[PDB]
Amino acid sequence: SEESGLPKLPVPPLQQTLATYLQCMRHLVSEEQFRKSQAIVQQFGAPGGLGETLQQKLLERQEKTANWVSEYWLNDMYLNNRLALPVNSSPAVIFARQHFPGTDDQLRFAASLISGVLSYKALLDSHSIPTDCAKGQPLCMKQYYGLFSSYRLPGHTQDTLVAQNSSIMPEPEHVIVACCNQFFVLDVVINFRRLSEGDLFTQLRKIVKMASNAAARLPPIGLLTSDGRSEWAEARTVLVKDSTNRDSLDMIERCICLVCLDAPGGVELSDTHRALQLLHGGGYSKNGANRWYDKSLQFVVGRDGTCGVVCEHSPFDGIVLVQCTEHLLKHMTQPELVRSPMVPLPAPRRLRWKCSPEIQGHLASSAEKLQRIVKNLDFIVYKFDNYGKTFIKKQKCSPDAFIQVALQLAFYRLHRRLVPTYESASIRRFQEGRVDNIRSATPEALAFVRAVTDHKAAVPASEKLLLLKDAIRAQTAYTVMAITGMAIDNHLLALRELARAMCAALPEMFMDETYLMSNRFVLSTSQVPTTTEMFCCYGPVVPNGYGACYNPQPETILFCISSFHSCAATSSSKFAKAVEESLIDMRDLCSLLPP
Ligand SMILES: C[N+](C)(C)CCO
C-alpha cells in the first residue's frame, strides 16, 4: 500500500467543459458579449487548437501528480488572495452560548476544551479516525492531518502553507494561549504524557495572572496577522530581523492551535454578536488583537460565555472542521477522564517580542485596517422557522438544492438579476480532493425566478411549480456533476495555468471578460450542517457580494448572511428577508394541487 487506493481527480473532456461553460454564462452576460465569447471559445477548443494542446498537458499532469489541481487551486483560492484573513477568508464556528459566573468557570471550560483537542489529536495521529464515506465510497482523509500541523506564512505576492513533518512533531507538543493580547506557550504533551484537565486549569490560572501584569505587558503583535497578506508579510519581515522575535514566531508556527481567553464583550450576546466576535474579535478595542490568524485553529473561550473557533481556510474545508469541532464538543460532554495526577508543573512561558519604531507604525496601521473591516461587515444570523428538511424532503427535493434555488430567488427578487454564484462541492472522493464549484445560477433558476417576480407575465402557479422543480433538478444535476469531478472551474483553472506556463500572455479564452466575470461570485455560499447547537459563517468574496452559509435542520434552517456596508447595493437584512419570502413562496408553490 503506502499509497492511496482512492481514485485520482478526473480530467473532464475538453468539449464537455467548454459547452457547459458557455451554457453557464449565456444568461449572465449581454448577447453581444456572449456572441464574442462563443467565437473565442470555438477557436480555443477547435481541432488541433490550443485547448486540445493544454488538455493533453493536463492529462500528462494528471498522470504525474496525485491531484492535478491541488497546487493551482490552493494558490488561486487562497494563497494568492491579498485580502486580510479576517472576514474575507477565515470562517468562524460559534458554539452555544456559555454561562461563566466566574473566571474559573471560563478556565474550566478552556481546560476541558483543550483536553478534548489533545484527545482528538491522539485519535488523528493514531489514524483511529473512521474513514469518512461519500454519504458510500471512501473519502480522502488528508485534510484531518492538516488540522493541527498547519501554519499559513504571509508572502509579498503569494502566501505559503507550511505542513510540519511527522518526524518533526515537537517534543513536547504545545498550544499557544492568547490572553490580553499576550501569547503564552502551554506545553500539553511531554513524553506521551498528556496534561490532566486539572493541570491545564492550574496553568491557565497562571497565564491569566501573568497576562494581567502591566510591567510585563508586551505589544499586541497578533494584530499584525489581521492585516492584508502583503502588509503582514512586510511587518513580519521586520520582526524576523531579531532573534527574540524569530523564536516567538517559531513557537506560534509550531503550536497545536490557539486558545483565546477573550475579554468580555460590551454587547448583548445574541448569535449575531457572538459570531462577530468570532469573525474579527470586534476590532483592537475589544479582542481583535487577541488572535493569530496564520494558525489554522483558534479556539475562543470568552470570559462572558462567547465560545467558538476561528478557522484559517487554506488547510482544510468546512466538513472536516465540523467533524472535529463536534467531536470536541461531544467529548466535553462525556464524564471527565481518569488519569490526571502529575507533580512538578513548570509555569507557562510568555512569548517575548523585540519592538521598535517600525513595528509600532505597523501596529497602528493594522489597527486602522482592522477597524475598517469591523465597520464594513454587515452580518446577520437569520433563523428560518416555518419549516426545514422534513417539509422539503416531502416534496421529493434535496434540501440543499431546494435552498440553493431559494437563494437564487432571494437574490433575484431583491436585486433583479442573477449573478455568478459559488457553492462548495466536495471532491474528497479523489486523492487530496478539496472542492470544486457548483454554479447555482443556472438557466432553469433564471426561468423560475423570472416567472415568480415578473407580475406582468402572470405565469400560472402550476407553471411556476414546474419551473421550480426543474430548477431544483438542474441544481441537483450540477451538484452531482461537481462532486464527481465533472464540473468546470477546476478544469478551466488548470487549463489556464498550464497555458500561463507556456507564455505569460494568457489565451484570449481566459482574458475574455466573460471568463473574468464568471469568477466574481457576487453570491458565495455553502451548506454547513451541524447536529450540535453551533453554526458556521464567513464574509463575502467580492465587494458587492454576499456570504450565505446555511445549516438546515428538520424543522428550521439557519442562515448566516454577510455583505459589505460599503456597497449600497447589498443589505444582509433585506437579503435575509428576501430569503424568507422565497422559502414561503416555494412552500406555497409545492402545496398546490395536481390536475
Ligand atoms: C466562502 N466560500 C463559500 C467560498 C467557502 C466556504 O467554505
From Swiss-Prot:
UniProt-reported outcome of changing residue 86 to A: In CMS6; impaired activity
Function per UniProt: Catalyzes the reversible synthesis of acetylcholine (ACh) from acetyl CoA and choline at cholinergic synapses.
Active-site residues, Swiss-Prot/TrEMBL: 313 (proton acceptor)
Cellular compartments per GO CC: cytoplasm; cytosol; neuron projection; nucleus; synapse
Keywords: Acyltransferase, Congenital myasthenic syndrome, Disease variant, Neurotransmitter biosynthesis, Phosphoprotein, Transferase
Effect of residue 350 to G: In CMS6; impaired activity
Presence of the UniProt keyword Phosphoprotein in the record: yes
Designated name of the protein: Choline O-acetyltransferase
UniProt disease annotation: Myasthenic syndrome, congenital, 6, presynaptic: A form of congenital myasthenic syndrome, a group of disorders characterized by failure of neuromuscular transmission, including pre-synaptic, synaptic, and post-synaptic disorders that are not of autoimmune origin. Clinical features are easy fatigability and muscle weakness affecting the axial and limb muscles (with hypotonia in early-onset forms), the ocular muscles (leading to ptosis and ophthalmoplegia), and the facial and bulbar musculature (affecting sucking and swallowing, and leading to dysphonia).
Enzyme class: transferase
One Gene Ontology term of the molecular function aspect: choline O-acetyltransferase activity
Effect the entry attributes to changing residue 366 to L: In CMS6; impaired activity
Family statement drawn from the similarity comment of this UniProt entry: Belongs to the carnitine/choline acetyltransferase family.
Residues involved in CoA binding: 388-400, 426, 527
Any GO BP: neurotransmitter transport
Enzyme Commission code: 2.3.1.6
Reactions this protein catalyses: choline + acetyl-CoA = acetylcholine + CoA
